[PDB]
Amino acid sequence: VKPNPLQDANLCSRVFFWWLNPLFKIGHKRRLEEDDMYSVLPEDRSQHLGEELQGFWDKEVLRAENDAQKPSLTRAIIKCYWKSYLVLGIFTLIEESAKVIQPIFLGKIINYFENYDPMDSVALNTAYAYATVLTFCTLILAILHHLYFYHVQCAGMRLRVAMCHMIYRKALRLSNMAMGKTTTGQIVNLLSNDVNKFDQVTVFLHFLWAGPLQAIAVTALLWMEIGISCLAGMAVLIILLPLQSCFGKLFSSLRSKTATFTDARIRTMNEVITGIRIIKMYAWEKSFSNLITNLRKKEISKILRSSCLRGMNLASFFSASKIIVFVTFTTYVLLGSVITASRVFVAVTLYGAVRLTVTLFFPSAIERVSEAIVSIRRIQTFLLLDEISVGFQAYKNYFRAGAHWIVFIFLILLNTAAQVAYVLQDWWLSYWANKQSMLNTEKLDLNWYLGIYSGLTVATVLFGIARSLLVFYVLVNSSQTLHNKMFESILKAPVLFFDRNPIGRILNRFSKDIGHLDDLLPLTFLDFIQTLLQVVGVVSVAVAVIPWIAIPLVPLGIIFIFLRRYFLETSRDVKRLESTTRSPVFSHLSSSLQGLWTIRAYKAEERCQELFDAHQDLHSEAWFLFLTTSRWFAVRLDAICAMFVIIVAFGSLILAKTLDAGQVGLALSYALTLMGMFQWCVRQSAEVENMMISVERVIEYTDLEKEAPWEYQKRPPEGVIIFDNVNFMYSPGGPLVLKHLTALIKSQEKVGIVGRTGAGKSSLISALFRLSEPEGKIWIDKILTTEIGLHDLRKKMSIIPQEPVLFTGTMRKNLDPFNEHTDEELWNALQEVQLKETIEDLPGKMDTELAESGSNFSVGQRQLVCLARAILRKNQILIIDEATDELIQKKIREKFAHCTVLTIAHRLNTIIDSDKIMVLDSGRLKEYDEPYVLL
Ligand SMILES: Nc1ncnc2c1ncn2[C@@H]1O[C@@H]2COP(=O)(O)O[C@H]2[C@H]1O
């Protein structure tokens, strides 16, 4: 079989995942299909994880039902997986304690510059020691975290695999009465949506007790540095949760109410795509055009506000680290204290460390735990039932449809004004600090130094809001513009384009792709741009001090550019395996629950369990590879992110004779913030490039085949049509079914027809309506058919379709979408349709629209509706093709004023002493005056 190198692996290779390099060399130029992914360990099999849990659950239910109590399943889970988390808590504690020690030893290097003496070498070795203690913490947070992460991630798949085994073992025991309650849907949902929530709980289970401790420690450390002023920064940090919950509650409403306007549009588009052969023939396009335009306009108007709310939230997240500092330090200065550089950046780091993680990870954990407990309760109640006895081109085409390039220039110039202020706000504080120390009581005026600080605080927020708003608007206008082109292009396509593409594909397109364009793209773009600009500022601040740091930057910048590729070229193949191995288990389960009686007939159910386990092991292998490959890259990245910090610190120390304390503090406080932002920036690009495929495939339309125009230059002013040796063909080079369509049907001669099945009887109607322009010409009452627009031709003809169709609407719009008749004229139209009793029995009697795809009626009255359409139209030429009968027969024989009927039917006896009759050959005709000659 396939041995996996996870075992047979020394230490120092599991920290860096050195056992995973060969695979890449193989996936670099071969596209591994299925036989190159290793098998799982012997302690991660379903048959091994689903037995101990079953035993513990049996023991627990026994101990519970023994007494007058209620049994629980959340106790049997902790009886098995308690040592694992007990051991992981040691490391999560060791890790949460290293983020509080960095700022303590950061403030000890700056104090060496505040108290500096060249002729002193005993006070410098202590500085080197302090700096050496500051690197082990980075190496702990950067290298030893990923093994722990992989383990805490693997701790969830075990539970997810243990639950499904017992769920299936139970489902194979349901009785007749018990299975009549729950059907296939719920049983497959228990595995497709519920168990899939245990993978994220273990990641967000340690914050519940690690957030408060961190906050308390941080505030206690702050008290010893500045004093009571610290409170002024912890108040602004708690108001954010109340101020952000309400706006989310408000946003959900907007979303819910726009979903309604979306669904109706989708339904209208669906019912429009099915029946094009009738709309294109009756000339009823503008109605649906307007019906879609109105709904799209409403949807956009409702989406703008939600997008604006999201942009405001992002801006708030961008500039919340400035208000806290501003408030706390203006208070600290007004109370009467003096400002130094060893107290400022320490507090900056403490804040930046606590606020983000706590306010962004404490709320999510609660939702995760709640959902997990709900799913556990569902599973518990279920387990108790009874039992038996791309490219730059796409980006350029997606951006230039939003606004003129001057707007893009303004946007580029507006995004590089927020970061400048973000950095200048701290440079000003370092400048103040350095100006304080050069005094001898020669006090500093606070008006100037405080007003400039306030102004630099205000500009940041203003620009950060403006940027987000403009970006969102520009990226929504692009979808607004593309959807139109899409619709007004697919509406003018031939019928052949629809005979090769099923409705499902086009509907899925119109729904999913536009949803992605309108919902997610702008937010991801904005977050990616923001996090990208947040890194260039760090690097530029680190270069403007110690200019020599530009030399070791060009190599670390070239390595990454390659590494990423060397990774993706095998990472774009694991998702395919995951999906292809996850679908068959669900298929097998769904098809296995129905054929159950035979499985019970023969006492053989041990094989199906083994087959299920074998099906699940493949997905287990794929998940293992996914986790390992995701962790193989972060270590390589963090190595560089930490080498940068080491270089900065030791270079600052080696050059302690040409720079001051404020500058080194500013450079160091930013270098301790690069890892997470770089990770997020590299993570967002994946999603961006993944969802840009929707944009790539949407633009595939907007340029397709296009039939002749609807209106030519020269307008037109008994239907005597004359034919010739013309020939007709569906495709330009397909087979041929009609040859030399030669015949003449002059003034109101009631033509007939007689034909067989498949010998080309339903083709001339497609040529008369020029659904596919054939070779040759056909004269009609002094004018041709190709020298006239499509609408000027398809409007002067009436057809009785074989399959009746009624659209969602009233009996007034479905029979007269264009307002040109009066009400009494419609009543007279429906006077001779033999159907006027049903209408009046309803409230409006003509305006009570119907639903359920017209299921309220049947073929009979629907064909009556079609005949009513034909009558109300009052045209000269008429083409009837049918394949109640007495009603239609007699009434059409009576009403129509003997105007050039063309009847087509499969029953020859439908003719009763007609005027002129024909037969069908395989493409030609055998006819003369009347059939009595031969017959
Ligand atoms: N909404 C978010 N979800 C996850 N990670 C984020 C988010 N926003 C920013 N990040 C980054 O992800 C990092 C995860 O670890 P840190 O808390 O050290 O710092 C975090 C940020 O750099």
Side-chain angles (χ1 to χ4, degrees):
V1 297
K2 304 178 281 302
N4 71 329
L6 182 47
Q7 59 192 356
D8 203 48
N10 184 227
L11 198 58
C12 317
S13 75
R14 309 182 175 189
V15 184
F16 300 106
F17 294 77
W18 197 268
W19 60 269
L20 199 65
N21 284 342
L23 179 73
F24 288 74
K25 288 187 179 67
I26 289 168
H28 181 48
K29 53 180 179 178
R30 210 266 306 290
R31 189 199 174 193
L32 70 165
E33 292 285 343
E34 200 184 297
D35 293 331
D36 314 323
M37 64 184 195
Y38 323 102
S39 62
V40 285
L41 279 298
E43 65 180 356
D44 293 1
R45 261 72 180 286
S46 61
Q47 294 185 14
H48 177 73
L49 304 179
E51 296 289 358
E52 59 94 21
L53 190 69
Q54 182 61 27
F56 273 68
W57 163 253
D58 290 309
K59 184 186 295 306
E60 194 279 343
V61 68
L62 189 148
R63 185 214 59 70
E65 279 138 21
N66 196 331
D67 293 331
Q69 303 181 13
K70 187 180 183 298
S72 181
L73 180 136
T74 315
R75 293 178 54 169
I77 286 177
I78 301 172
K79 291 278 188 64
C80 310
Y81 308 142
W82 65 283
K83 304 184 177 178
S84 303
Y85 188 79
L86 178 67
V87 170
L88 299 169
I90 313 315
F91 193 90
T92 192
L93 183 66
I94 288 169
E95 194 180 80
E96 276 287 356
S97 171
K99 291 201 288 294
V100 177
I101 305 174
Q102 273 170 335
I104 299 181
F105 288 94
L106 169 61
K108 289 188 174 182
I109 304 176
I110 311 171
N111 210 326
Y112 162 61
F113 288 94
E114 295 183 11
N115 313 116
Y116 187 81
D117 205 318
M119 297 294 101
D120 187 356
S121 309
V122 57
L124 190 151
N125 308 329
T126 320
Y128 273 138
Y130 291 139
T132 296
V133 177
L134 177 142
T135 300
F136 297 164
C137 306
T138 58
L139 296 179
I140 280 167
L141 294 161
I143 288 168
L144 292 161
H145 165 58
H146 305 282
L147 193 62
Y148 154 79
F149 203 93
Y150 160 60
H151 270 299
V152 71
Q153 264 173 328
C154 193
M157 68 165 282
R158 289 181 182 174
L159 186 66
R160 181 193 79 207
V161 172
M163 296 315 289
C164 286
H165 180 61
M166 54 161 51
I167 280 173
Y168 193 83
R169 176 178 170 171
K170 181 62 171 186
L172 287 185
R173 289 162 172 267
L174 296 180
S175 296
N176 57 3
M177 71 291 286
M179 201 162 37
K181 300 288 97 175
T182 186
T183 63
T184 61
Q186 308 100 313
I187 300 162
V188 67
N189 198 5
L190 287 192
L191 316 188
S192 45
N193 293 111
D194 294 338
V195 295
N196 298 112
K197 295 182 180 305
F198 299 146
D199 299 337
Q200 291 290 353
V201 172
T202 52
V203 184
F204 293 115
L205 188 63
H206 65 269
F207 286 105
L208 273 56
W209 68 265
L213 293 179
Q214 189 173 7
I216 295 164
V218 164
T219 180
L221 281 176
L222 283 163
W223 263 84
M224 299 178 187
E225 288 174 2
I226 52 178
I228 184 79
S229 309
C230 72
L231 302 176
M234 313 306 291
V236 175
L237 181 48
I238 283 172
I239 292 173
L240 296 180
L241 304 155
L243 261 56
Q244 84 191 13
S245 66
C246 281
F247 290 5
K249 269 183 170 56
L250 192 155
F251 178 87
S252 279
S253 178
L254 277 295
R255 183 179 57 177
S256 178
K257 75 168 60 172
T258 192
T260 289
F261 291 102
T262 287
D263 289 298
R265 181 182 70 78
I266 297 181
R267 185 185 318 113
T268 304
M269 187 60 56
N270 176 47
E271 66 89 20
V272 161
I273 293 164
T274 52
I276 279 284
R277 293 173 169 272
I278 309 298
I279 302 166
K280 194 180 293 308
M281 207 180 290
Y282 276 111
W284 285 354
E285 290 79 339
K286 302 178 176 179
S287 294
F288 307 113
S289 176
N290 312 335
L291 261 59
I292 300 290
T293 301
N294 300 345
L295 303 171
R296 185 65 186 167
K297 189 187 292 183
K298 295 179 185 169
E299 186 183 2
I300 290 287
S301 70
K302 291 278 178 297
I303 281 166
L304 283 166
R305 290 92 185 277
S306 46
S307 66
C308 179
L309 267 289
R310 283 178 178 176
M312 185 66 66
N313 172 28
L314 264 64
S316 177
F317 183 95
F318 164 75
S319 60
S321 43
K322 298 305 190 189
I323 311 299
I324 313 178
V325 185
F326 162 73
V327 175
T328 184
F329 278 114
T330 186
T331 313
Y332 168 73
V333 174
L334 278 174
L335 286 181
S337 304
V338 185
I339 187 162
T340 53
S342 49
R343 275 83 182 276
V344 175
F345 307 100
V346 180
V348 167
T349 315
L350 274 302
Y351 290 131
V354 62
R355 54 154 285 269
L356 159 64
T357 74
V358 304
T359 195
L360 181 61
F361 300 128
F362 193 80
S364 301
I366 309 174
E367 307 185 355
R368 299 286 186 274
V369 173
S370 301
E371 296 175 359
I373 289 169
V374 167
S375 311
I376 290 164
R377 284 177 180 167
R378 289 183 194 173
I379 294 166
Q380 187 194 159
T381 68
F382 174 81
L383 289 175
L384 292 170
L385 275 61
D386 302 298
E387 61 90 22
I388 61 170
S389 179
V390 300
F392 193 63
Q393 281 293 336
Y395 297 82
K396 187 179 75 170
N397 294 325
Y398 179 60
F399 289 153
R400 82 187 184 79
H404 203 210
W405 39 267
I406 62 183
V407 176
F408 279 101
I409 280 172
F410 270 106
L411 170 54
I412 283 166
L413 176 139
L414 192 67
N415 299 350
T416 70
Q419 207 60 30
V420 175
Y422 205 91
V423 178
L424 290 175
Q425 177 162 337
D426 300 320
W427 162 80
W428 180 252
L429 208 55
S430 88
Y431 184 80
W432 189 352
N434 285 349
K435 290 283 280 188
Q436 182 75 40
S437 70
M438 294 203 297
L439 293 177
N440 295 112
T441 307
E442 285 189 349
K443 293 188 176 295
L444 298 186
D445 54 350
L446 305 179
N447 307 329
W448 187 61
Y449 287 99
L450 210 70
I452 301 183
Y453 199 42
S454 310
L456 297 157
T457 312
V458 169
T460 315
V461 181
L462 297 185
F463 287 110
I465 299 168
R467 162 182 76 185
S468 298
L469 300 183
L470 196 149
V471 169
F472 266 102
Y473 175 80
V474 166
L475 273 71
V476 163
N477 197 334
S478 54
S479 176
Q480 178 179 357
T481 292
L482 272 69
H483 170 98
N484 300 338
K485 294 188 173 179
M486 270 183 73
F487 178 61
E488 65 191 3
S489 178
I490 198 169
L491 196 74
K492 294 191 284 296
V495 307
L496 179 60
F497 169 85
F498 298 100
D499 263 358
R500 62 178 67 270
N501 314 129
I503 301 102
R505 189 183 305 182
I506 311 173
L507 192 66
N508 181 76
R509 195 157 300 194
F510 269 90
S511 176
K512 307 297 197 281
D513 292 345
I514 302 180
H516 274 83
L517 297 199
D518 291 328
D519 273 28
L520 295 168
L521 261 176
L523 180 139
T524 312
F525 268 105
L526 180 54
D527 203 351
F528 166 61
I529 286 163
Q530 167 179 326
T531 315
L532 196 162
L533 295 175
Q534 271 187 349
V535 177
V536 175
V538 169
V539 167
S540 304
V541 173
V543 168
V545 195
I546 311 160
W548 307 93
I549 293 163
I551 312 175
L553 272 179
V554 296
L556 307 168
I558 292 162
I559 298 291
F560 179 65
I561 294 290
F562 284 92
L563 178 65
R564 185 67 172 174
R565 308 215 308 272
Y566 189 77
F567 171 72
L568 293 174
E569 190 173 4
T570 180
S571 198
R572 296 181 301 197
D573 305 342
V574 182
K575 282 75 174 173
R576 182 197 64 183
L577 309 178
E578 288 188 36
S579 306
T580 295
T581 55
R582 187 168 62 188
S583 74
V585 54
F586 287 127
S587 178
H588 180 99
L589 169 52
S590 63
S591 67
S592 63
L593 188 57
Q594 278 212 40
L596 187 150
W597 291 102
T598 300
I599 298 171
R600 278 179 173 162
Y602 319 95
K603 53 176 81 68
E605 64 189 2
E606 268 194 69
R607 304 182 68 176
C608 194
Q609 190 69 246
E610 295 197 280
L611 294 175
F612 193 61
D613 308 327
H615 274 284
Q616 191 177 1
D617 292 339
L618 272 63
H619 187 48
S620 296
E621 296 168 8
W623 199 254
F624 173 64
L625 276 191
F626 177 67
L627 305 179
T628 51
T629 43
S630 60
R631 293 291 108 199
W632 176 92
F633 182 52
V635 189
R636 268 69 176 182
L637 193 156
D638 303 3
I640 302 165
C641 282
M643 195 187 306
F644 184 76
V645 175
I646 288 170
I647 287 170
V648 167
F650 278 102
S652 158
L653 290 173
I654 287 173
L655 295 165
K657 207 203 187 309
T658 59
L659 59 89
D660 290 331
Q663 278 182 341
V664 56
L666 173 66
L668 263 167
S669 61
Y670 275 7
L672 304 172
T673 68
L674 180 54
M675 207 181 298
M677 58 175 48
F678 201 88
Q679 296 276 104
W680 200 239
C681 181
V682 171
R683 184 261 192 185
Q684 282 295 359
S685 313
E687 276 72 7
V688 163
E689 285 162 25
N690 169 34
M691 62 170 47
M692 282 293 286
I693 297 168
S694 303
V695 177
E696 178 267 1
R697 69 168 56 177
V698 166
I699 301 166
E700 186 180 3
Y701 295 168
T702 77
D703 46 27
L704 300 169
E705 298 297 89
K706 194 188 300 306
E707 59 186 359
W710 296 344
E711 193 267 339
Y712 286 150
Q713 282 281 272
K714 56 184 171 297
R715 294 284 297 175
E718 59 188 20
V720 169
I721 59 172
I722 295 90
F723 298 78
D724 299 324
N725 273 330
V726 311
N727 64 319
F728 168 84
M729 189 181 288
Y730 290 166
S731 296
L736 185 150
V737 181
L738 274 293
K739 190 254 193 190
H740 296 177
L741 291 71
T742 302
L744 268 77
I745 301 92
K746 70 103 159 184
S747 309
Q748 60 91 30
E749 68 184 34
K750 301 203 155 56
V751 183
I753 200 68
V754 177
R756 312 165 294 273
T757 303
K761 177 52 71 209
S762 66
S763 178
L764 74 164
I765 60 170
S766 296
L768 294 172
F769 295 146
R770 62 187 312 191
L771 269 50
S772 308
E773 290 195 358
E775 306 180 11
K777 55 94 178 172
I778 47 180
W779 276 74
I780 183 174
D781 69 326
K782 308 268 188 152
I783 299 99
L784 280 296
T785 48
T786 53
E787 277 60 60
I788 303 290
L790 300 179
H791 273 113
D792 274 348
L793 177 137
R794 300 165 169 168
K795 191 179 288 188
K796 203 195 164 162
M797 291 182 285
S798 314
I799 185 169
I800 307 305
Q802 172 174 182
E803 198 278 336
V805 177
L806 72 91
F807 302 110
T808 299
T810 76
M811 299 292 175
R812 185 261 170 190
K813 270 78 80 180
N814 200 1
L815 279 69
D816 184 69
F818 302 89
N819 188 338
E820 196 271 328
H821 292 196
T822 62
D823 62 334
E824 72 274 15
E825 183 174 9
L826 270 289
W827 285 105
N828 287 317
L830 61 83
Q831 167 265 324
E832 70 259 21
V833 304
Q834 297 293 107
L835 183 64
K836 73 180 290 178
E837 181 64 26
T838 58
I839 57 182
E840 190 276 331
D841 273 18
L842 307 187
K845 313 163 285 187
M846 72 166 209
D847 288 346
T848 71
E849 65 279 358
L850 273 290
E852 61 173 19
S853 66
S855 182
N856 65 292
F857 285 169
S858 70
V859 177
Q861 53 263 53
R862 284 185 293 183
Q863 188 174 152
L864 294 186
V865 175
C866 310
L867 180 63
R869 298 172 205 262
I871 284 177
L872 187 147
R873 170 164 289 188
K874 294 304 183 186
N875 196 242
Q876 183 63 31
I877 299 168
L878 172 72
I879 301 103
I880 307 179
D881 176 79
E882 190 275 330
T884 61
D885 288 330
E886 57 95 12
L887 194 69
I888 59 183
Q889 183 67 258
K890 191 259 280 181
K891 200 57 174 168
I892 68 188
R893 284 283 155 77
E894 182 65 26
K895 286 298 302 185
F896 298 117
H898 61 291
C899 49
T900 308
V901 303
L902 274 81
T903 301
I904 298 169
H906 280 166
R907 278 63 178 150
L908 74 164
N909 213 315
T910 55
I911 298 302
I912 299 89
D913 291 331
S914 280
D915 293 331
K916 190 178 289 294
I917 301 296
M918 329 174 55
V919 301
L920 176 61
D921 290 342
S922 181
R924 276 85 68 195
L925 69 169
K926 309 171 154 289
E927 61 154 354
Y928 205 54
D929 199 327
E930 72 180 10
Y932 185 80
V933 181
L934 189 151
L935 189 146

